[PDB]
Design a protein around this ligand. Structure first.
Ligand SMILES: *[C@@H]1O[C@H](CO)[C@@H](O[C@@H]2O[C@H](CO)[C@@H](O)[C@H](O)[C@H]2NC(C)=O)[C@H](O)[C@H]1NC(C)=O
Ligand SMILES: *[C@@H]1O[C@H](CO)[C@@H](O[C@@H]2O[C@H](CO)[C@@H](O)[C@H](O)[C@H]2NC(C)=O)[C@H](O)[C@H]1NC(C)=O
Ligand SMILES: COc1ccc2cc(CCC(C)=O)ccc2c1
Ligand SMILES: *[C@@H]1O[C@H](CO)[C@@H](O)[C@H](O)[C@H]1NC(C)=O
Ligand SMILES: [Fe+3]
Ligand SMILES: [Zn+2]
Ligand SMILES: [Zn+2]
Length: 341
């Protein structure tokens, strides 16, 4: 009667979803698809109810009629009187990250370097950096800017996938799910950390959560923040402590989307689910933590404190903000009002 079908992207998210499903007594169940776009289609068909999406994906989903329902909310400094669920989200900082040792690499020298992206169509990983590059370059040939990239979701035979590594068996190169070694925030940062790419397009939080012992993962356990620099738009380089003065954009927080007709029910169930499995949840960590994935950001980002209610009932365009929507629209002209499916 009140069962929510979550859409998991790839087999690792599927595994976490199944654990959530078990622990929830089948109040949540799981559909799985290979890509985020496929999950959006499942939701559109009514074969799944909801999933949590990066802003670039919210754009795709929103064009197709899906609506934002609750947003990720991480640790915050203002909005102090307020409980996390009622606290207004503050967006995250999209950054360009390089190795300090890669001296003289700036925003202005990026042409014909190697790049690491979270995925095509994602905010910090793609829409922001490529939007800026297309703009300043005056060219839609964003596929010819970097010499090689890992941009999960691009054509696997193209240079945009050249740096992608696939899964442990070396299969699924460039798939836009966590099976691709260099997928997502953590994967794109790993792509930089291992010096596969010269630059990673990620968010401020990724740099911090994967350095100075914050991650015990083999590739990350030895990383020091001091070995990294942020690329500012004015051509300068800054320590990763300076993200507030050296970022590419403020991104709208990842958020849960659903069909408008299921939004009320999805919200209700999620608010109850996080009461059980969220940050201070009754049953986390003893049984299941909804916002933990061993840094793999499965289903939700690992730094999520809670899912927050959205003031005003925003449309997807209101949630993303007019400037970001128009930035995406402008970028999409390279590849105006219609669902892609
Ligand atoms: C960039 O991201 C990092 C990681 O999320 C932020 O550092 C955290 O900030 C909170 C307070 O907001 C601290 O209580 C945590 O201890 C910090 N985490 C770590 C691992 O150090 C940092 O504030 C962000 N910088 C900006 C400018 O937003
Ligand atoms: C890239 O350039 C386009 C075109 O100038 C930008 O789109 C403009 O954005 C401003 C500020 O939000 C709007 O007031 C204009 O109406 C937009 N112009 C057009 C022609 O659509 C876009 O924001 C830029 N992209 C990025 C990522 O900065
Ligand atoms: C943290 O993620 C969010 C959440 C809601 C947002 C709402 C807006 C509204 C600004 C407009 C034009 O609606 C902008 C950016 C937003 C970013
Ligand atoms: C499932 O949902 C109902 C409320 O609709 C509740 O009675 C039941 O205990 C819930 N259990 C879990 C584990 O979420
Ligand atoms: Fe994102
Ligand atoms: Zn700013
Ligand atoms: Zn409104």
């Amino acid at each position: 009667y009140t069962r929510v079908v979550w859409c998991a992207v790839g087999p690792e998210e599927q595994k976490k979803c199944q654990q959530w499903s078990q622990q929830s007594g089948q109040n949540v169940t799981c559909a799985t698809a290979s890509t985020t776009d496929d999950c959006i289609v499942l939701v559109l068909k009514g074969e799944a109810d909801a999933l949590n999406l990066d802003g670039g994906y919210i754009y795709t989903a929103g064009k197709c009629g899906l609506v934002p329902v609750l947003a990720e909310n991480r640790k915050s400094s203002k909005h102090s009187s307020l409980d996390c669920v009622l606290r207004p989200t503050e967006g995250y900082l999209a950054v360009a990250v390089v190795k300090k040792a890669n001296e003289g690499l700036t925003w202005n020298s990026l042409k014909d370097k190697k790049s690491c992206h979270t995925a095509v169509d994602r905010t910090a990983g793609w829409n922001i950096p490529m939007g800026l590059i297309v703009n300043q370059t005056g060219s839609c040939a964003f596929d010819e800017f970097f010499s090689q990239s890992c941009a999960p979701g691009a054509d696997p035979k193209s240079r945009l996938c050249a740096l992608c590594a696939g899964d442990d068996q070396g299969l699924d190169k460039c798939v836009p799910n966590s099976k691709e070694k260099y997928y997502g925030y953590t994967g794109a940062f790993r792509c930089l950390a291992e010096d596969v790419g010269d630059v990673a397009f990620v968010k401020n939080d990724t740099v911090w959560e994967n350095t100075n012992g914050e991650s015990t993962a083999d590739w990350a356990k030895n990383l020091k923040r001091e070995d990294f620099r942020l690329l500012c738009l004015d051509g300068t380089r800054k320590p990763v402590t300076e993200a507030q003065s050296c970022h590419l954009a403020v991104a709208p927080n990842h958020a849960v989307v659903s069909r408008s007709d299921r939004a009320a029910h999805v919200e209700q169930v999620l608010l109850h689910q996080q009461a059980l499995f969220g940050k201070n949840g009754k049953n986390c960590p003893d049984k299941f933590c909804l916002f933990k994935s061993e840094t793999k950001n499965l289903l939700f980002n690992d730094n999520t404190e809670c899912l927050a209610k959205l003031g005003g009932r925003p449309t997807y365009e209101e949630y993303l903000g007019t400037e970001y929507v128009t930035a995406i629209a402008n970028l999409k002209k390279c590849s105006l009002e219609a669902c892609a499916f």
